[PDB]
Structure 1
Amino acid sequence: TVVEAKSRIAVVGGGGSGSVAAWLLARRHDVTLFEADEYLGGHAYSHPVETDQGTLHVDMGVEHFNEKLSPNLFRLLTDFGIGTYVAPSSVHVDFPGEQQSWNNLDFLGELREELHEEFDRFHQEMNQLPTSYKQMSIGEYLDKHGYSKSFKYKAMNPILSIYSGCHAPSLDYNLMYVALSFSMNLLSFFSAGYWRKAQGGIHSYLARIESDLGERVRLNTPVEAVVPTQSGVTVLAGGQEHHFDQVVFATHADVTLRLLRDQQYRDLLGDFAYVPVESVLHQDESWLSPAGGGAYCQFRMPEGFELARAEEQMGSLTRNCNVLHPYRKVSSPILITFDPQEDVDPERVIVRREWKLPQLRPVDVRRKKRLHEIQGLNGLWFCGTDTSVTGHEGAIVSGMVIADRLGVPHPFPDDAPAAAQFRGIKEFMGV
């Protein structure tokens, strides 16, 4: 397929992937970016919180990345003159009994006493692993390598749930992803992980992308349908018909399919599994740990847990924002509880967000790769979290891959690691 310059190209979905694709495609082509909600970024949302220090753009979805893991995102932020800061992944885990806890800052707690030897063995086994087990599950490994049910549900499951989704079948996800998160110091039982945050919310780089695009962006304009035709492609958005030569989808595969209007498409876009996530921005200081109230990530398992019913019981993850270095002078509590099990005072709740995260079982990964088939067929292209590897870097680099295929080359060839990532994703996507 040959795509001429100055073509009319639409971008459906304006999250991180859409926005990057739209922004690079604004060079070379005439682009329009359709976004259902009142802002750019989607999972990258920074909610304004009023405080004594000013207005804070509090990250409720996407929060963390770093310069090793996310090179392209890092250069992008740099060039936009956006600073990053270190937000170490300090973790404290609370369970029902007296002193029934553990943390990655000190060696205190009954669970630490009960489990230290397994935390220690785990780190060794994880590190020796990347160097069978090709697509294995973390749960299968734990069982086959004699780890206690206590480690499985009191250590493994909570740590995995500091992201990776609480509702998610965390113990079923790919072994290599856990082995890598541990070797790369993203998760650890002995130290806080090396995580970075963007200066003045993650939205900062999107807010710039938004200005740079200007009139090309349609906020509050949900697409209703994308109909490829003999002539070109027809987009029905915000009660109007639009004529384009190409259409780029940066929406979740389920949304992509509902908007697309062949049953090869139903095969490749249907069956994509998701996990509900509820981010709750609140100020109810009763969620803070009485012993670990100084750690960034605080996990709490409610009363009547019962280790035998462990698959049924679920804990809640709170994020102590006041522990973030920019929020040090701020006097008002800033908490984020994901999927709260116990109650959260409605009087103290700033806002709630309801999102869906893709599952990461090797089958889901196998599904993603297969999309290479419908790429650049009937003037359609697919990018986003569902077409790429996990994380923000994965999403925004996927948008870069599609933009590159439409004659806008990778913006940072100079940056060796950023070029390597792009080469990786382009290869993963089969584009």
Structure 2
Amino acid sequence: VVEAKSRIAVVGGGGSGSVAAWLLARRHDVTLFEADEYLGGHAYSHPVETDQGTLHVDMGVEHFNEKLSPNLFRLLTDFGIGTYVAPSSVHVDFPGEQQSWNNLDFLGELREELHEEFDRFHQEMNQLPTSKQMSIGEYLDKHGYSKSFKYKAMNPILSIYSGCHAPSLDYNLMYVALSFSMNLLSFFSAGYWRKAQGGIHSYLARIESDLGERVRLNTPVEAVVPTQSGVTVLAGGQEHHFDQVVFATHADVTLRLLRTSDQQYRDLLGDFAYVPVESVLHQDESWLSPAGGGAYCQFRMPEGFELARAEEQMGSLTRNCNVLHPYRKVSSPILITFDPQEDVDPERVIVRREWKLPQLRPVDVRRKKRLHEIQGLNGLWFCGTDTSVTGHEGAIVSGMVIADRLGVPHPFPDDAPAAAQFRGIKEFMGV
């Protein structure tokens, strides 16, 4: 039971928090706390100086579609932010001579070896959504796919979203099925993908401007204490009082900040699974695949791979930003290596970033759904990646869902797919 013009705090300045604060700001007194020096979190664009001018390179969140991300798209559109097609072309390289396969054509020894399996996979995945809670790994095993397919094709292609470190093979089937079914990932063609003009940051910079002074950068919240009068927030050596609090931070962070003598919170937010990611923005051209170049996503496997004990060895994924259409005139290399197994030359490094991605096993999905129990109690609310469906659309729409619960309705009722997303995420979240 929330009255208008309440004092509301939003903890976490990532996509979900920023969009939640921004929508909440219309009807309530809103304050947004953010630990780091910018808004976005995983949505980060780093300025790179080049012969064409200053480019803002997306190191984390970078992909969406008008179909997959309707709310994010309408938002970018309403902000006069242009988008552009950056197709998901993939090149996978293995230690043996010509042990490769790619999205664009049929070249490589690995392509020869696995072609029939790639072919059956697409069919099976397209036929699957029709006529559930099973891992991709389980599926591949029961449907007689080779171990070589699992580790030389499936695991590398899934690394683009999941990160090379991820136990991707343990992720729910529908997530993989739909990534194929909706041409996001393919073995035969580059996936239909878009990026935002001047980086993903552009939409967040606008939100920051709209919120102005309500945004508290470099203000990590240390504790959240509900009381009888209202919730108390401790941040930057000050105590702030609020009617309600919205957590837009990771479940592990939420729990660390959250201070209550209730152990339901420990049950619900305890041991959410995460995957660490190290994003390396660099100019070391040695990372490009000799046979690779032209492909956007370049996966490389180090020398001592060994198919038996495939799990111990890990791969490295590189984004070749030069391939991006707006970066076509740039003379200097712009590369992003995630979790580089081999050392990246330090003289060529621009910046490093360290994040953690949530795991997507059917158990993790079940864990996420269960939060509706604590939704709205002690004047607390939870949005973000850990409370919603995977991807940026899911993160920001969870923020939207909470704003609707606090009076500010879904801002795009006209956009039928955006309303469809909203309704879907609302059903998924306990709200």
TM range (shorter): over 0.9
CA distance in 1, matches of 2:360, 2:376: 25
Displacement, 1:370?
A: 0.8
CA distance in 1, matches of 2:164, 2:410: 35
SS at match of 2:341: coil
SS at match of 2:157: helix
Equivalences for 1:233-244 in 2 at 5 Å?
233-244=231-242
**CA displacement, residues 309-338 of structure 1 (integer Å, 9 cap, x when unaligned):** 211111100000000000000111000000
Displacement, 1:343?
A: 1.3
CA distance in 2, matches of 1:419, 1:167: 35
SS at match of 2:68: coil
CA distance in 2, matches of 1:136, 1:373: 25
CA distance in 1, matches of 2:6, 2:383: 19
Partner in structure 2 of residue 313 of structure 1: 313
- Overall identity of the aligned pairs, in %: 100
**CA displacement, residues 48-73 of structure 1 (integer Å, 9 cap, x when unaligned):** 00000010110000000000000000
CA distance in 1, matches of 2:235, 2:343: 39
CA distance in 1, matches of 2:144, 2:229: 62
CA distance in 1, matches of 2:93, 2:55: 29
**CA displacement, residues 176-216 of structure 1 (integer Å, 9 cap, x when unaligned):** 11111101000000000000000000000000000000000
Displacement, 1:353?
A: 0.4
Displacement, 1:39?
A: 0.2
CA distance in 2, matches of 1:188, 1:227: 48
Q: Which runs of 5+ in 1 are unaligned?
A: none
CA distance in 2, matches of 1:230, 1:104: 59
Partner in structure 2 of residue 144 of structure 1: 142
Displacement, 1:139?
A: 1.2
CA distance in 2, matches of 1:200, 1:364: 34
Displacement, 1:248?
A: 0.5
Displacement, 1:168?
A: 1.0
CA distance in 1, matches of 2:81, 2:99: 41
Displacement, 1:140?
A: 1.3
CA distance in 2, matches of 1:285, 1:411: 44
The worse-fitting range, judged by mean Cα deviation, of 139-148 and 315-324 is: 139-148
SS at match of 1:163: helix
CA distance in 2, matches of 1:40, 1:328: 28
Partner in structure 2 of residue 338 of structure 1: 338
Displacement, 1:260?
A: 0.6
CA distance in 2, matches of 1:205, 1:137: 34
Displacement, 1:11?
A: 0.5
CA distance in 2, matches of 1:70, 1:276: 25
CA distance in 1, matches of 2:183, 2:376: 38
The worse-fitting range, judged by mean Cα deviation, of 407-416 and 113-122 is: 113-122
Matched, 1:217 2:225: no
Matched, 1:264 2:264: yes
CA distance in 1, matches of 2:427, 2:111: 43
What stretches of structure 1 move > 4 A for 4+ residues in a row?
none
The worse-fitting range, judged by mean Cα deviation, of 162-171 and 325-334 is: 162-171
CA distance in 2, matches of 1:13, 1:58: 22
Displacement, 1:143?
A: 1.3
Displacement, 1:41?
A: 0.2
SS at match of 1:408: coil
The worse-fitting range, judged by mean Cα deviation, of 149-158 and 324-333 is: 149-158
Aligned-pair Cα RMSD in Å: 0.8
Partner in structure 2 of residue 375 of structure 1: 375
Partner in structure 1 of residue 123 of structure 2: 124
CA distance in 1, matches of 2:143, 2:406: 48
SS at match of 1:197: strand
Displacement, 1:253?
A: 0.5
SS at match of 2:347: coil
Displacement, 1:430?
A: 1.7
Displacement, 1:242?
A: 0.3
Displacement, 1:131?
A: 0.9
CA distance in 2, matches of 1:50, 1:207: 19
SS at match of 1:310: coil
**CA displacement, residues 367-413 of structure 1 (integer Å, 9 cap, x when unaligned):** 11110011111111000000000000000000000001100000000
Displacement, 1:304?
A: 1.4
Displacement, 1:171?
A: 0.7
Displacement, 1:220?
A: 0.2
**CA displacement, residues 99-135 of structure 1 (integer Å, 9 cap, x when unaligned):** 1101010111000111111111111111111119x21
TM-score scaled by length of structure 1: 0.99
CA distance in 1, matches of 2:163, 2:303: 21
TM-score scaled by length of structure 2: 0.99
CA distance in 1, matches of 2:242, 2:151: 52
CA distance in 1, matches of 2:118, 2:226: 54
CA distance in 1, matches of 2:231, 2:137: 46
Equivalences for 1:195-210 in 2 at 5 Å?
195-210=193-208
CA distance in 2, matches of 1:147, 1:375: 42
Partner in structure 2 of residue 102 of structure 1: 101
**CA displacement, residues 212-231 of structure 1 (integer Å, 9 cap, x when unaligned):** 00000000000011111111
Equivalences for 1:30-429 in 2 at 5 Å?
30-131=29-130, 134-261=132-259, 262-429=262-429
CA distance in 1, matches of 2:353, 2:204: 19
Displacement, 1:89?
A: 0.4
Number of equivalenced pairs: 429
CA distance in 1, matches of 2:367, 2:145: 31
CA distance in 1, matches of 2:157, 2:387: 26
Displacement, 1:145?
A: 1.2
CA distance in 2, matches of 1:375, 1:177: 25
SS at match of 1:161: helix
CA distance in 2, matches of 1:162, 1:425: 24
Q: Which runs of 5+ in 2 are unaligned?
A: none
SS at match of 1:294: coil
Displacement, 1:147?
A: 1.1
SS at match of 1:350: strand
SS at match of 1:98: coil
